[PDB]
Curated annotation (Swiss-Prot):
Function of the molecule: Beta-galactoside-binding lectin that acts as a sensor of membrane damage caused by infection and restricts the proliferation of infecting pathogens by targeting them for autophagy. Detects membrane rupture by binding beta-galactoside ligands located on the lumenal side of the endosome membrane; these ligands becoming exposed to the cytoplasm following rupture. Restricts infection by initiating autophagy via interaction with CALCOCO2/NDP52. Required to restrict infection of bacterial invasion such as S.typhimurium. Also required to restrict infection of Picornaviridae viruses.
Residues reported in the UniProt entry to bind a carbohydrate: R62, N72, E82
Organism: Homo sapiens
Coiled coil: none
Name of the gene: LGALS8
Quaternary structure, from the entry: Homodimer. Interacts with CALCOCO2/NDP52. Interacts with PDPN; the interaction is glycosylation-dependent; may participate in connection of the lymphatic endothelium to the surrounding extracellular matrix.
Domain named Galectin: residues: 12-145
Protein's UniProt name: Galectin-8
Tissue specificity field: Ubiquitous. Selective expression by prostate carcinomas versus normal prostate and benign prostatic hypertrophy.
Notes concerning its domains: Contains two homologous but distinct carbohydrate-binding domains.
């Protein structure tokens, strides 16, 4: 992997060091604490706090009861329609590997070496330049694979 970031402070907000062309991989390895309610991985257009940067891809594992993964897009500080994946592999007190692959018309996400979900592009992925990681999660490493 390229441009690796080890043991970042959460919340992490960092520039993705190259364009998100088809085939680009974002590999995030980490662990969910015992008391975690949720965390999120956001692919953003910039890092503006106010107004809040558009989030092309909001990937949001939630842990109450059986848990889920909520996926959405934030444009001009307005959330779109949620896409909820109920078959979640994430668990409190367990380590994980997230691999986000950028395809032409969608993201594909695999967790722990297994397909988890697809998310169709609502913003052009060329506009994404920032990776945000927020909430109750411990991130061990962030890596990128570009062409
Ligand atoms: C603002 C608010 O409370 N919205 C509720 C949703 O929670 C938000 O969901 C988005 C993604 O769609 C973000 O994760 C944000 O951080 C959350 O506050 C909630 O998911 C739905 C019910 O499922 O209700 C909204 O009112
Ligand atoms: Cl619970």
């Amino acid at each position: 992997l390229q441009n690796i970031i080890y043991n970042p402070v959460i919340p992490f907000v960092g520039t993705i060091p190259d364009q998100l062309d088809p085939g680009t991989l974002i590999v995030i390895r980490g662990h969910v604490p015992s008391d975690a309610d949720r965390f999120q991985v956001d692919l953003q257009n910039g890092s503006s706090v106010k107004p809040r940067a558009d989030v092309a891809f909001h990937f949001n594992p939630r842990f109450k009861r059986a848990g889920c993964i909520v996926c959405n897009t934030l444009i001009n500080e307005k959330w779109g329609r949620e896409e909820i994946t109920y078959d979640t592999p994430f668990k409190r007190e367990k380590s994980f590997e997230i691999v986000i692959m950028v395809l032409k018309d969608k993201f594909q996400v695999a967790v722990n070496g297994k397909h988890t979900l697809l998310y169709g592009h609502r913003i052009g992925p060329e506009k994404i330049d920032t990776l945000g990681i927020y909430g109750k999660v411990n991130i061990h490493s962030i890596g990128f694979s570009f062409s």
